[PDB]
Design an enzyme around this catalytic site. Structure first.
Site, short mmCIF file in Angstrom:
data_model
loop_
_atom_site.label_atom_id
_atom_site.label_comp_id
_atom_site.label_asym_id
_atom_site.label_seq_id
_atom_site.Cartn_x
_atom_site.Cartn_y
_atom_site.Cartn_z
CG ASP A 27 -1.15 16.11 4.85
OD1 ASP A 27 -2.17 15.54 4.70
OD2 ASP A 27 -1.05 16.74 5.99
CG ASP A 46 -0.17 8.75 12.73
OD1 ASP A 46 1.01 9.56 12.35
OD2 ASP A 46 0.23 7.56 13.15
CB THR A 83 -8.87 14.71 6.90
OG1 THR A 83 -8.83 14.70 8.30
CG2 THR A 83 -9.33 16.21 6.53
CB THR A 84 -7.93 12.89 1.76
OG1 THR A 84 -6.87 13.25 2.37
CG2 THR A 84 -8.02 12.80 0.53
N1 LIG Z 1 -2.25 -0.85 2.26
C1 LIG Z 1 -3.39 -0.27 1.84
N2 LIG Z 1 -4.05 -0.74 0.67
C2 LIG Z 1 -5.20 -0.51 0.26
N3 LIG Z 1 -5.84 0.70 0.78
C3 LIG Z 1 -5.35 1.48 1.53
C4 LIG Z 1 -4.22 1.01 2.13
N4 LIG Z 1 -4.01 2.14 2.76
C5 LIG Z 1 -4.91 2.81 3.20
N5 LIG Z 1 -5.80 2.61 2.07
C6 LIG Z 1 -7.12 3.50 1.64
O1 LIG Z 1 -6.83 4.72 1.45
C7 LIG Z 1 -7.81 5.49 2.18
C8 LIG Z 1 -7.00 6.72 2.62
O2 LIG Z 1 -6.24 6.47 3.52
P1 LIG Z 1 -5.25 7.60 4.58
O3 LIG Z 1 -4.21 8.12 3.55
O4 LIG Z 1 -5.03 6.93 5.90
O5 LIG Z 1 -6.47 8.57 4.87
P2 LIG Z 1 -6.49 10.15 3.99
O6 LIG Z 1 -6.45 9.74 2.70
O7 LIG Z 1 -7.71 10.63 4.64
O8 LIG Z 1 -5.35 10.90 4.59
C9 LIG Z 1 -8.40 4.81 3.14
O9 LIG Z 1 -9.94 4.73 2.96
C10 LIG Z 1 -8.07 3.30 2.73
O10 LIG Z 1 -9.14 2.33 2.51
#
Ligand SMILES: Nc1ncnc2c1ncn2[C@@H]1O[C@H](COP(=O)(O)OP(=O)(O)O)[C@@H](O)[C@H]1O
Ligand SMILES: Nc1ncnc2c1ncn2[C@@H]1O[C@H](COP(=O)(O)OP(=O)(O)O)[C@@H](O)[C@H]1O
Ligand SMILES: Nc1ncnc2c1ncn2[C@@H]1O[C@H](COP(=O)(O)OP(=O)(O)O)[C@@H](O)[C@H]1O
Ligand SMILES: Nc1ncnc2c1ncn2[C@@H]1O[C@H](COP(=O)(O)OP(=O)(O)O)[C@@H](O)[C@H]1O
Lengths: 512, 208, 523, 529, 73
Positions: free
Chosen positions: A48, A379, A81-82
Site C-alpha cells: 500500500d 473505499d 493517492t499513489t
Molecule cells: N483491472 C485493471 N486494469 C487496468 N488498469 C487498472 C485496473 N485496476 C486499476 N487500474 C489502474 O491502476 C491505477 C491505480 O489504481 P489503484 O490501485 O486503485 O489506485 P492507487 O494505485 O492510487 O492505489 C489506476 O490509475 C487505474 O487506471
C-alpha cells in the site's frame, strides 16, 4: 543548516522524485511488494502506497510535504493517492528546462498552470455519464476495489451496503449535495455471524453497555429523551470539591445531593419515556432512579450522534432535564433493543425513516475477518460518494493520461513562445502511469507505449488504454476499468499544485 | 537517492538478497528431511539442550539472524497450525522455486511473469493430486503405515513400534459413528526413572 | 579479492559494465570534441589560444587548425575527426557542421538508449532521416549562381564563407578573392584551389593587399637584372658557397701566398661555374640557402637573374609548375632538368619588390593573392579564410545551388523532418524526431556565441516558419535577439556543403553507435 | 592581553558584518515583488511555514548574529512606522554595506562613507519631494481604473477588467469622509461583497447602499419601506432565560404553568413598546417570537430575525442606532425611545437569485455600499471576491495617502542619475560614497527584474536611459517617470499603468536603510564575554 | 555487504560448511574429553591436580570427580 540557490530546486526534485520511485511499482492490480526493515529486525511486506511512506523516515522537508499532501488525499478519496505522488515526481523530474536551460520557475509554473486548465477540459471531453438509478452499473464500478479481495465471495453485498448507505446521507435538497461518511454513516462492528450477515441499520447504533438488568429489553414504540446536562448534584461555578468533617453537616449536604438529583429525575419520567440519553455522564444515585423507572440508562453520546436521533425518532434536545416539554418524545420509532448480540450489547433505535444518516452493521466470524470487511467497505462508500457527487467516469488503464497528453501535444503546436517546451513535458509525464502498469506486467514498455500513443492519434481517445493483468491493449468499453472524474481532476490538480509548490521554493530557511 | 540515517536497494539486487536467504535456509533444513536425516540442536544459552527434526521447532523456537529468512519461519508456524506437517518440505520447495526463477530472471525475465506460471502450475498440480489420492477406508493396518511414516521422521527407528500402537489406539478410542474428533481428549504425561522404551497407554487419567 | 571487475578479460582494458553504459562513454568523448569547437561556430566565434608543438602561440578560430593541434587520442572522436577530413574532400567548408551536428546526434541518442530503445533501431531512424533530409534540401534552394563570372556576383555570395574566419574584413577579402577566382573560371572544367595561391608579406594591414598573376614570391630579386624572358630556369638546392669536391680533394695550404692562390683558384672556378649556367642557355638561377658575394657579381656579369627561395614549400611549388627540379650539386650544368616559363620579372607592389612568374605567351590559369599584415599570426589566420573562401566557389563550378544560412535551413529541415516522424508509426519516430532536434543545435550555437538566449531564437525561428516565412535566420547582433531574412541580407550557404555535411555527420554518428566496446590488440 | 572572553579587531570585522547582512538580504531578495517566490521556514519542532512575504519572513527568521539582529530590529521600525517596504530596506542596506566595504579596501574611511550616505539621503528625499504627484485624478481622469485593472488581471476576472474596475473606483470614492480637519481616509472595513447565480459574470450590479442576506419571513409584511426609523435590538423577543449555565430550578408543577403563561404575556408589552416607537425597518439579532412576527404583519413593520452580529454592527454605524442589549433598565422595561432609532430614506427588498437581499438607502452617515457578485458558479464568485478585495485596497492605499510616487524602480532609477551628478559637485572624500549610494539603489529594479524572469542588465539600463534623458533636457520627446512592468518585461509609464506607492515608504525606506548601514559601518571591533 | 557468511544465519551460530565438516568439530570436543580421562585408567592411572570452585586443591584419579569440577560446556 540551510540551503540557497539552484541547489534547493534541484534538491527538492530529487527528494520528491525519490519518494515517487519507491511507489512506482505499487500501481495497478499487479502491484509489486515492498520490504520494510523494522528497527527490531522485523519485516512488513505491505504493498500500500500510503502505508509505505507512513513508516519511512524522511529528512528533507520537501518529502514531508509530498507525504502530508498524500494523507490529505486519503481523507477525501481513498483511491488514486499513489498516482498523485508519481505524477508530481514525474512533472518535477524534468530538470532539463528547469536549471540546465536556465529558465525561471515562473516561466515553468505558468506553463504547468496553463496545462492544468487544459488537462481538466480534456478529461471532461472523454468523460461519460452514468445512470446511478441502475445499481448494476455501480456494481461494475465498485468492483475496482472488491476485485482481488476476500470479500469477492460477497461482492454484491458490499455494493448494496455502500450504495444504499451513501444515498441516505446524500441530502441533495441543499443544492451542493454534500455527503459526510464520517458523521452521518458511523460504522460499528458486531461480533458473531458471518460476512453474509453484514447489513445496514436504518438508524443510529450506540455501543453503550447495559449496566443494570432493569432496562427496556424490547419495545415497539420507543420514546427517546435528549439533554446535554449531567444528572448529578448542582456544583459551584468552580471545580472545588466538597470537603466535610462534621457528621451533622453530612445529612445537609447529602439531602441537597439527593433532592436535586431526585427532582430532576422526576421530570424526566413524567413523559413516561423508555430510555434517557444524556451527553454527559450519569452518577450512581441518578442511575438508581433510571432502574426504578424501568428505563434504559445511556450516556456519553456526542452532539452529532444526538442530532441524528432527534431526526430519527423525533426527539428534541434540551439544555437541562427540568425544561423537558412533551415534544421530546421518540414517537414513530421502530424499536428499542439492547440485546447482547455476540457477547456485546448494542442499542438499536432503528425506524422506517431515513433521517439523513445511517449506521453500518459489520457482522463476521472473527476480528480478523471483520477488519478485512471494514477497510474494504470504506473505499466502496467513497467511490459511491465520488460518483454520486459527479456522475462522470473517464477511461482508466492509462487511457485518460494518453488521451490528455495527445490534446496538449496537438495544442502546443499553436503555443508560440518558450512555454511550449515545459507544456509538452507535462504531457510526456502523464505517460508514466501506463509506463508502470506495463512494467509490472512484464511486457515491453517502449513497444506498447509507442503503439498506445498511435491509437489515440487515429482512433478515438476515449478508449484503447492498457490491461494491467494481461499487459496487452484493450478498450475500456470492453473492460470496466472506468474511474470517476472527481478523483482524476483532484489527482491532476494536486500533482501540478504540489509541483508548483516545490518549484516555488528557492531557500530552505531555519527559524521560529 | 536516499535520506540520511537510512538505506535503500533500488536495483534488482534487493531480490537477490531474498533469494540468497532462502537458498541458505534451504541448505540448513535439507539435512533433517525424512528418517535418515540428521538432527539439529537448539542451545537456549541458559544451558538447555534440545534435539529435534521438526522444522516448525527449528524455525519457531530458533531465532534467525537474517531478516528475510525470519518471514519464512512465520509461515512454517502457520503451516504447522493447519496440517502440523510439511514445514521442512515447504522451505525446500520455496528455496528451489526462487532458485529456478533466478536462472530466468538473470536472462531479463520479469518476476511477475514467473509468478503467473506458478498459479497455473498450482492448479494443474492441484487437479492431479485429486487423481492420485486413495480414498480407501481407514483401518488399523492403514493408520499404522501413516503413524510409522510420521514417527520415523522424529525418532531413532527404535520407538517406532512403541509409539505406533499407542498413537493409533489413542485416536480410535476417541472416534466412532463418524463423530468429530479432538486431540485435546488425549493427555500427554511425562515421567522419569524409566527407559525411553517404557512408553505405554493409560485408559484413564493421571493426577499430580 | 572477489568480486573484482566484471567483463574485463582483454588486456585489462577499461571495460564499462552494463551499469556503466560503455556506449554512453564513447559518446561523452564526442560531446567534449564539440564543446572545443561549438564556441568557434559562426561570425561571432570565439578564438582559441592554441599552443603549437613548437611552443608557438597562435590565436585562431579555425576548426581544422584546432583539431590538427589538439591531439585527439580517443578513437570514438577520431571517427568524427575523420569525417571532418572527409568533409575537406568535395567541399572546403562545413567542418564544424560535422562536429556540432554529430555531437548532437550522439548526445540525443543517449536520451533514447536511456529509455531502452535499441542502438540498432536508433541507427535506422538516423539513416531514414538522412535520406529524408536529402529530399527536402533541394526544396530549400532559394537562389542559384548566375555563373556570369561577375565580381559583383562572386564577391556577394563569397561574403558568407569569409565571415566566421575573419569577421569585419569580409568586404576586402571578398573582392580580392573574386578577382582571383573570376580569372580562371573561363578555364571551363579545370578550376582548383591549387591555382589560386597565397603569399603573405609583413606590411601595414589587411587593407594594403592586392592580387597579382603568376606564382608570386615575396623575396625580391637579389640580382641586378630587372626582367628576363628566358624559359630555362635552373633550380639548385645547394647554396652558393665554398665548393667541396665529392672525391678526396685534399687541400693543403701552409704559407700565406698559397692561401691567396687557392682563394683565387676558387674565384676562377666559380666564374667558370656561373659561366656554365649561361652556356646551357639559362639566364635564371635559383638558390635555397645563402648566396655568395663573388657569385652575386657573376650573376650580373652574364646578366643571369639571381633568385632566392629560402622556404622549402616555395621551391616545391615551382618544381610542379615549371619543372625545374633541385639538384644536390652546386651549379651542375644539367640543362635537361631545367624548367620552362614564358615570363619572369620583378614588380613593386605595396612598397615591396616581389619575384613574379607570369605566363604571357601561354594562356595562363594561375594566380596569387598577395596578403599584407603587421603580424604573421594574423596573415596565417587570413590565409585559412582564403582556402575556405576559394573552395566555396570550387564547389559552385559544380551544380550551382545555394540555400539560406544563419540556421534558417536547420529549422526548416528540422520542421519538415519532425512532421515526417510524427506521421510515421513505429519506433523509428523517436530517433527521427531527435534527428530534427540535432539540427537545432546549430542555431543554438550561433545564438550562444552572440550572447543571446538560444531558446528565444528557436521559438522565433519556428514561429516565422510556421507562417511560411522561409529563408529566415538568426540576426547576428548583441543587443537584438530578433531574426531577419537571410535572402535580403545576402547570407547564403552552399547546397553541397550541407549535403555532404549531413551525410558524413550521420555516418560518423552511426559508426560510433555501432561500436559498443573498445578492445586493445597486438601484432 | 589576558581576559575572561575574546576579542577580534581589524577590517575583517566589517567584512564579517557585511557578509552577514548580505546573507540576510539574499533570504528575502528573490521574494521581492508580487511575483516573489515562496520560501520554507523550518522551525525547531519541524513545522514548515511556507510564504513569500518579506515581512513575515523576517519576523520568523532566526539568525544568531548581531548584525542580522540590527536589521531585525530595523524591520520593526519600518513595520510600525509605515507597514511596508521592509524587504527593500534590508536589500538596500545590504548593498550599501557591500559597496562601502569595497571603498574601505580603497583606503576610504567609514566616516567619509557615513558622511556621503547622509548627504545622499537628504538630496534623494529632496528630488523625491520635487517629483511627486498629489492625491488627485479621482473623477474625470484615469490613473485609477488602470491601477485596479492591473491588480485583478491575475484571476479569471481579467476577461473584462473595465466592467469590474468601474465598480471599484465608483465605490472607493463613495466611501469617502473627511471627519478630521480635511483628513479624508477610507475604512478597512469596506464595501460588502455578496454574490448570486445570475447566469453570467456581467450581470453583477453596483448598489448604492448596504445589502443584507436575510428575509422578513412572513409575506404579510411590506417589502418597500420609506420610514427613517431603524430599530436595532440585540435582546431576543423569544423565550428569555436566566443563563445557559444557570437553569431556573422549578419544583411545583403549578409554578411551571404560570411561567409559561407570563412569558407569553410579557412579550405583549415588549411588542407594544417596540411598535409604539414607529420603527418599521426592525432588525433582531437573537431571533423573534412567532407570535411577535404576526404583530408586525398587522402593524406592517419590516422586521427581520436572526440577523448576523457583524452585518448588524455595520448597520448601526450606518443609521446611527444605539445597540441595546436589554430592555430592562435595572428596575423595569423600556425601548429607549429616540436612542436605538436610526435615520434613513428608503428600504426595499429586491429580487435576487436564491436569496432576497434587503437594500438600505441613504442612511445618516455610513460611507459604505454593497456589491452583489452575480456570476455563473461559486468558483467564479469566490475568486472575484478575492480579486476585488485585493484591488479595493490597491486604490484605497493611493487615495488615503496624501502623496505618491512612481514605483517599480522609477525612484531608484531616477536617483541613480541625479546623485551620480550631485557627487561631482561636492568632492572632499564623499564623491565616491554618494556614487556608490546611487549604484546601490539599482538593486531594487535589478532584483525585481530577476524575479520577473527577464534580463536585469537590460531593463535596468533601459530605465536609467529614459530617466537620464529627462535630466538632459525637459523636452517632451524624452519619456519621463518611466517604471518597470514585470509581466510584459518592458518599461512602462506608471502614471498611466497606475503602479503607485506612498511617498513615506520610499522616503523612510531610504532613511532607515541608510541609518542601518551607518550603524554597522561604525562597528570596527567585537568583544565577547 | 556481500559476500555473506557461509551458512551463518541463526543467531550468529557458527555453521561450519560442508568443506569445514561441522560433524568433525563435535567429534573433536568429545575426542578431547577422552584424552583428559584416558590417562586416569587402571591401577597406573595418572592423578589430576584439580582446583575446586572454592580454590581448594584436591588430587584424585576418579573420572566422575573430574567431570564435576571440569565444567564441560
Ligand atoms: N483491472 C485493471 N486494469 C487496468 N488498469 C487498472 C485496473 N485496476 C486499476 N487500474 C489502474 O491502476 C491505477 C491505480 O489504481 P489503484 O490501485 O486503485 O489506485 P492507487 O494505485 O492510487 O492505489 C489506476 O490509475 C487505474 O487506471
Ligand atoms: N519409509 C519412508 N520412506 C521414504 N520417505 C519417507 C518415509 N517416511 C517419511 N518420508 C518422507 O519424509 C518427508 C518429511 O516427513 P515429515 O518429517 O513428516 O515432514 P517434515 O519433514 O516436513 O516435518 C516426507 O516428505 C516423506 O516423503
Ligand atoms: N552574417 C551572418 N549571419 C548569420 N549567420 C552567419 C553569418 N555569417 C556566417 N554565418 C554562419 O556561420 C556558419 C559557419 O560558417 P563557416 O565557418 O564557413 O563553416 P564552419 O563553421 O563549418 O567552418 C554558416 O552555417 C553560416 O550560416
Ligand atoms: N504592481 C506592481 N508592479 C511593479 N512592481 C511592484 C508592484 N507592486 C509592488 N511592486 C514592487 O515590489 C516591491 C516590494 O513591495 P512590497 O511587498 O509592498 O514591500 P516589501 O517587499 O518591502 O514588503 C516594491 O519595491 C515595488 O517596487
Amino acid at each position: 543548516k540551510r540551503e540557497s540557490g539552484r541547489k534547493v530546486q534541484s534538491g527538492n526534485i530529487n527528494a520528491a522524485k525519490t519518494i515517487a520511485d519507491i511507489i512506482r511499482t505499487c500501481l495497478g492490480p499487479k502491484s509489486m511488494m515492498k520490504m520494510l526493515l523494522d528497527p527490531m529486525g522485523g519485516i512488513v511486506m505491505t504493498n500500500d502506497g500510503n502505508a509505505i511512506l507512513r513508516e519511512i523516515q524522511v529528512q528533507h522537508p520537501a518529502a514531508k510535504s509530498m507525504i502530508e499532501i498524500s494523507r490529505t488525499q486519503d481523507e477525501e478519496v481513498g483511491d488514486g493517492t499513489t498516482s498523485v505522488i508519481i505524477l508530481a515526481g514525474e512533472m518535477l523530474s524534468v530538470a532539463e528546462h528547469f536549471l540546465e536551460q536556465q529558465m525561471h520557475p515562473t516561466v515553468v509554473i505558468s506553463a504547468y498552470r496553463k496545462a492544468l486548465d487544459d488537462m481538466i477540459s480534456t478529461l471532461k471531453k472523454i468523460s461519460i455519464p452514468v445512470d446511478i438509478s441502475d445499481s448494476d452499473m455501480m456494481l461494475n464500478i465498485i468492483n475496482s476495489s472488491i476485485t482481488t479481495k476476500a470479500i469477492s465471495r460477497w461482492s454484491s453485498l458490499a455494493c448494496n451496503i455502500a450504495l444504499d448507505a451513501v444515498k441516505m446521507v446524500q441530502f441533495e435538497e441543499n443544492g451542493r449535495k454534500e455527503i459526510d461518511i464520517k458523521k452521518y454513516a458511523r460504522v460499528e462492528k458486531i461480533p458473531g455471524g458471518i460476512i453474509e450477515d453484514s447489513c445496514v441499520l436504518r438508524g443510529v447504533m450506540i455501543n453503550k453497555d447495559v449496566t443494570h438488568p432493569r432496562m427496556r429489553r424490547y419495545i415497539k414504540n420507543p420514546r427517546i429523551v435528549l439533554l446535554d446536562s449531567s444528572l448529578e448534584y448542582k456544583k459551584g461555578e468552580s471545580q472545588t470539591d466538597i470537603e466535610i468533617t462534621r457528621e451533622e453537616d453530612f445529612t445537609r449536604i447529602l439531602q441537597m445531593e439527593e433532592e436535586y438529583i431526585q427532582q430532576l429525575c422526576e421530570d424526566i419520567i413524567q413523559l413516561k419515556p423508555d430510555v434517557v440519553i444524556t451527553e454527559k455522564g450519569i452518577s450512581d444515585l441518578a442511575q438508581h432512579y433510571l432502574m426504578r423507572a424501568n428505563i434504559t440508562a445511556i450516556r456519553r453520546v456526542r452532539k452529532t450522534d444526538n442530532n441524528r436521533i432527534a431526526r430519527a425518532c423525533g426527539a428534541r434536545i434540551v439544555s437541562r432535564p427540568e425544561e423537558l416539554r412533551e415534544d421530546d418524545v421518540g414517537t414513530g420509532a421502530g424499536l428499542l433493543e439492547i440485546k447482547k448480540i455476540g457477547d456485546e450489547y448494542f442499542t438499536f433505535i432503528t425506524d422506517c425513516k431515513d433521517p439523513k444518516a445511517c449506521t453500518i452493521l459489520l457482522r463476521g466470524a472473527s476480528k480478523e475477518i471483520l477488519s478485512e470487511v471494514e477497510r474494504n467497505l470504506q473505499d466502496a462508500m467513497q467511490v459511491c460518494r465520488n460518483v454520486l457527487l459527479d456522475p462522470q467516469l473517464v477511461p482508466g488503464g492509462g487511457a485518460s493520461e494518453m488521451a490528455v497528453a495527445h490534446a496538449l501535444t496537438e495544442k502546443s503546436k499553436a503555443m508560440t513562445g518558450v512555454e511550449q517546451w515545459p507544456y509538452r513535458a507535462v504531457a510526456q509525464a502523464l505517460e508514466v502511469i501506463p509506463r508502470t502498469l506495463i512494467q509490472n506486467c512484464g511486457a515491453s514498455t517502449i513497444r506498447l507505449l509507442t503503439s498506445l500513443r498511435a491509437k489515440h492519434t487515429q482512433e478515438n481517445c476515449e478508449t484503447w488504454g492498457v490491461n494491467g493483468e494481461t499487459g496487452t491493449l484493450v478498450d475500456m468499453k470492453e473492460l470496466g476499468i472506468w474511474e470517476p472524474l472527481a478523483v482524476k481532476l483532484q489527482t491532476y490538480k494536486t500533482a501540478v499544485e504540489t509541483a508548483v509548490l516545490l518549484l516555488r521554493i528557492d531557500d530552505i530557511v531555519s527559524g521560529h | 537517492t536516499l535520506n540520511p540515517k537510512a538505506e535503500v536497494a533500488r536495483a534488482q539486487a534487493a531480490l537477490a538478497v531474498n533469494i540468497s536467504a532462502a537458498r541458505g535456509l534451504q541448505d540448513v533444513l535439507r539435512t533433517n528431511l525424512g528418517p535418515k536425516g540428521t538432527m539439529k540442536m537448539l542451545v537456549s544459552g541458559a544451558g538447555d539442550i534440545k534435539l529435534t527434526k521438526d522444522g516448525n521447532v527449528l524455525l519457531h523456537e530458533m531465532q534467525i539472524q537474517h531478516p528475510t529468512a525470519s518471514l519464512i519461519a512465520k509461515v512454517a508456524t502457520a503451516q504447522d497450525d493447519i496440517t502440523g506437517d510439511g514445514t521442512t518440505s515447504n522451505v525446500l520447495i520455496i528455496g528451489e522455486l526462487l532458485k529456478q526463477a533466478d536462472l530466468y530472471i538473470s536472462e531479463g525475465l520479469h518476476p511477475r511473469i514467473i509468478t503467473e506460471g506458478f498459479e497455473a502450475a498450482k492448479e494443474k498440480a492441484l487437479q492431479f493430486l485429486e487423481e492420485v489420492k486413495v480414498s480407501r477406508e481407514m483401518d488399523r493396518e492403514t493408520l499404522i503405515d501413516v503413524a510409522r511414516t510420521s514417527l520415523r521422521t522424529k525418532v531413532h527407528a527404535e520407538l517406532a513400534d512403541v509409539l505406533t500402537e499407542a498413537v493409533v489406539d489413542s485416536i480410535l478410542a476417541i472416534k466412532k459413528q463418524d463423530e468429530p474428533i479432538d486431540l485435546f481428549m488425549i493427555e500427554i504425561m511425562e515421567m522419569k526413572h524409566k527407559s525411553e522404551t517404557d512408553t505405554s497407554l493409560i485408559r484413564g487419567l493421571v493426577l499430580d | 579479492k572477489a568480486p573484482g571487475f566484471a567483463q574485463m578479460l582483454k588486456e585489462g582494458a577499461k571495460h564499462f559494465s552494463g551499469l556503466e553504459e560503455a556506449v554512453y562513454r564513447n559518446i561523452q568523448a564526442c560531446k567534449e570534441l564539440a564543446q572545443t569547437t561549438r564556441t568557434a561556430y559562426g561570425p561571432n566565434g570565439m578564438n582559441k589560444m592554441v599552443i603549437n608543438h613548437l611552443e608557438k602561440l597562435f590565436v585562431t578560430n579555425d576548426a581544422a587548425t584546432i583539431l590538427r593541434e589538439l591531439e585527439v587520442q580517443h578513437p570514438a572522436a577520431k571517427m568524427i575527426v575523420m569525417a571532418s577530413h572527409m568533409q575537406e574532400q568535395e567541399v572546403g567548408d562545413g567542418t564544424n557542421f560535422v562536429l556540432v551536428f554529430a555531437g548532437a546526434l550522439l548526445e540525443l541518442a543517449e536520451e533514447l538508449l536511456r529509455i531502452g530503445l535499441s542502438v540498432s533501431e536508433v541507427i535506422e531512424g538516423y539513416e531514414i532521416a538522412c535520406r529524408k533530409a536529402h529530399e527536402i534540401l533541394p526544396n530549400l534552394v532559394c537562389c542559384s549562381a548566375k555563373n556570369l563570372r561577375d565580381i559583383d556576383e562572386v564577391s556577394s555570395l563569397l561574403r558568407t564563407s569569409i565571415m566566421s574566419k575573419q569577421y569585419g574584413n569580409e568586404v576586402f577579402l571578398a573582392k580580392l578573392i573574386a578577382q582571383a577566382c573570376v580569372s580562371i573560371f573561363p578555364d571551363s572544367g579545370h578550376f582548383n584551389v591549387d591555382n589560386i595561391r597565397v603569399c603573405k608579406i609583413l606590411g601595414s594591414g589587411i587593407s594594403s593587399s592586392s592580387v597579382l598573376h603568376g606564382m608570386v614570391f615575396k623575396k625580391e630579386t637579389e640580382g641586378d637584372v630587372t626582367s628576363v624572358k628566358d624559359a630555362k630556369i635552373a633550380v639548385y638546392s645547394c647554396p652558393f658557397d665554398g665548393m667541396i669536391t665529392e672525391t678526396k680533394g685534399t687541400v693543403l695550404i701552409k704559407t700565406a701566398e698559397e692561401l691567396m692562390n687557392f682563394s683565387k683558384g676558387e674565384e676562377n672556378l666559380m666564374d667558370a661555374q656561373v659561366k656554365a649556367i649561361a652556356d646551357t642557355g639559362a639566364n635564371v638561377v635559383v638558390t635555397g640557402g645563402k648566396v655568395a658575394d663573388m657569385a652575386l657579381h657573376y650573376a650580373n656579369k652574364y646578366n643571369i637573374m639571381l633568385v632566392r627561395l629560402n622556404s622549402k614549400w616555395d621551391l616545391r611549388r615551382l618544381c610542379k609548375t615549371v619543372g625545374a627540379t633541385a639538384l644536390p650539386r652546386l651549379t651542375p650544368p644539367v640543362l635537361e632538368e631545367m624548367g620552362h616559363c614564358d615570363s619572369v620579372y620583378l614588380s613593386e607592389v605595396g612598397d615591396t619588390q616581389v619575384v613574379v612568374f607570369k605566363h604571357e605567351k601561354e594562356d595562363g590559369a594561375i594566380s596569387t593573392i598577395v596578403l599584407r599584415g603587421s603580424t604573421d599570426n594574423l596573415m596565417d589566420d587570413i590565409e585559412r579564410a582564403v582556402d575556405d573562401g576559394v573552395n566555396t566557389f570550387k564547389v559552385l563550378t559544380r551544380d550551382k545551388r545555394l540555400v539560406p544560412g544563419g540556421g534558417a535551413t536547420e529549422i526548416e529541415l528540422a520542421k519538415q523532418i519532425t512532421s515526417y516522424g510524427e506521421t510515421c508509426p513505429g519506433l523509428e519516430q523517436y530517433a527521427i524526431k531527435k534527428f530534427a532536434e540535432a539540427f537545432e543545435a546549430i542555431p543554438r550555437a550561433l545564438a550562444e556565441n552572440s550572447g543571446v538566449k538560444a531558446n528565444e531564437v528557436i521559438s522565433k525561428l519556428y514561429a516565422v516558419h510556421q507562417e511560411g516565412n522561409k529563408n529566415v535566420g538568426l540576426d547576428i547582433e548583441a543587443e537584438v535577439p530578433a531574426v531577419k531574412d537571410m535572402l535580403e541580407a545576402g547570407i547564403l550557404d552552399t547546397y553541397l556543403g550541407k549535403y555532404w555535411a549531413i551525410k558524413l555527420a550521420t555516418n560518423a554518428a552511426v559508426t560510433v553507435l555501432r561500436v559498443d566496446q573498445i578492445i586493445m590488440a597486438k601484432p | 592581553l589576558s581576559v575572561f572572553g575574546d576579542r577580534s579587531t581589524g577590517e575583517t570585522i566589517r567584512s564579517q558584518n557585511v557578509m552577514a547582512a548580505a546573507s540576510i538580504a539574499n533570504i528575502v531578495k528573490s521574494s521581492l515583488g508580487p511575483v516573489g517566490l515562496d520560501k520554507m521556514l523550518v522551525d525547531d519542532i519541524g513545522d514548515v511555514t511556507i510564504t513569500n512575504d518579506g515581512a513575515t519572513i523576517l519576523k520568523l527568521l532566526e539568525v544568531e548574529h548581531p548584525a542580522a539582529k540590527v536589521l531585525c530590529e530595523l524591520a520593526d521600525l519600518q513595520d510600525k512606522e509605515v507597514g511596508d517596504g521592509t524587504t527593500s530596506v534590508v536589500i538596500i542596506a545590504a548593498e550599501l554595506l557591500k559597496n562601502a566595504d569595497e571603498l574601505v579596501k580603497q583606503k576610504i574611511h567609514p566616516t567619509s562613507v557615513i558622511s556621503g550616505y547622509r548627504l545622499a539621503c537628504k538630496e534623494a528625499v529632496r528630488y523625491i519631494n520635487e517629483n511627486l504627484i498629489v492625491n488627485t485624478d479621482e473623477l474625470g481622469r484615469d490613473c485609477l481604473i488602470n491601477a485596479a485593472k492591473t491588480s485583478m488581471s491575475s484571476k479569471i476576472i481579467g476577461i473584462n477588467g473595465d466592467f469590474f474596475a468601474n465598480m471599484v473606483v465608483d465605490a472607493v470614492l463613495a466611501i469617502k469622509y473627511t471627519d478630521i480637519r480635511g483628513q479624508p481616509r477610507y475604512p478597512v472595513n469596506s464595501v460588502n461583497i455578496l454574490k448570486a447565480h445570475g447566469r453570467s459574470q456581467m450581470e453583477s450590479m453596483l448598489i448604492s447602499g448596504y445589502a443584507l442576506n436575510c428575509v422578513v419571513g412572513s409575506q404579510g409584511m411590506p417589502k418597500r419601506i420609506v420610514n427613517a426609523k431603524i430599530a436595532c435590538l440585540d435582546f431576543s423577543l423569544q423565550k428569555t432565560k436566566m443563563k445557559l449555565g444557570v437553569q431556573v430550578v422549578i419544583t411545583d408543577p403549578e409554578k411551571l404553568d404560570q411561567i409559561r403563561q407570563r412569558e407569553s404575556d410579557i412579550t405583549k408589552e415588549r411588542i407594544q413598546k417596540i411598535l409604539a416607537t414607529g420603527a418599521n425597518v426592525i432588525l433582531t439579532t437573537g431571533g423573534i417570537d412567532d407570535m411577535c412576527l404576526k404583530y408586525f404583519v398587522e402593524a406592517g413593520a419590516m422586521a427581520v430575525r436572526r440577523v448576523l452580529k457583524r452585518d448588524l454592527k455595520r448597520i448601526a454605524k450606518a443609521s446611527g442606532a444605539t445597540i441595546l442589549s436589554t430592555l430592562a433598565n435595572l428596575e423595569g422595561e423600556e425601548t429607549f425611545e429616540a436612542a436605538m432609532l436610526g435615520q434613513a430614506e428608503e428600504v426595499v427588498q429586491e429580487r435576487i437569485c436564491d436569496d432576497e437581499l434587503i437594500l438600505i438607502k441613504n442612511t445618516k452617515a455610513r460611507t459604505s455600499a454593497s456589491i452583489i457578485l452575480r456570476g455563473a458558479n461559486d468558483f467564479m464568485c469566490d475568486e472575484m471576491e478575492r480579486s476585488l478585495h485585493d484591488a479595493l485596497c490597491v486604490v484605497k492605499r493611493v487615495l488615503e495617502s496624501k502623496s505618491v510616487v512612481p514605483g517599480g524602480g522609477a525612484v531608484e532609477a531616477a536617483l541613480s542619475i541625479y546623485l551620480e551628478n550631485y557627487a561631482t559637485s561636492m568632492g572632499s572624500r564623499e564623491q565616491l560614497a554618494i556614487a556608490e549610494f546611487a549604484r546601490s539603489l539599482l538593486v531594487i529594479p535589478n532584483t525585481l527584474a530577476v524575479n520577473a524572469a527577464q534580463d536585469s542588465t537590460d531593463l535596468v539600463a533601459k530605465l536609467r536611459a529614459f530617466h537620464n534623458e529627462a535630466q538632459v533636457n525637459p523636452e517632451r520627446k524624452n519619456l519621463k517617470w518611466i517604471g518597470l512592468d514585470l509581466s510584459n518585461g518592458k518599461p512602462r509609464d506608471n502614471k498611466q499603468a497606475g503602479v503607485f506607492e506612498p511617498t513615506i515608504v520610499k522616503v523612510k525606506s531610504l532613511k532607515f536603510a541608510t541609518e542601518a548601514a551607518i550603524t554597522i559601518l561604525r562597528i570596527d571591533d567585537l568583544i565577547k564575554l
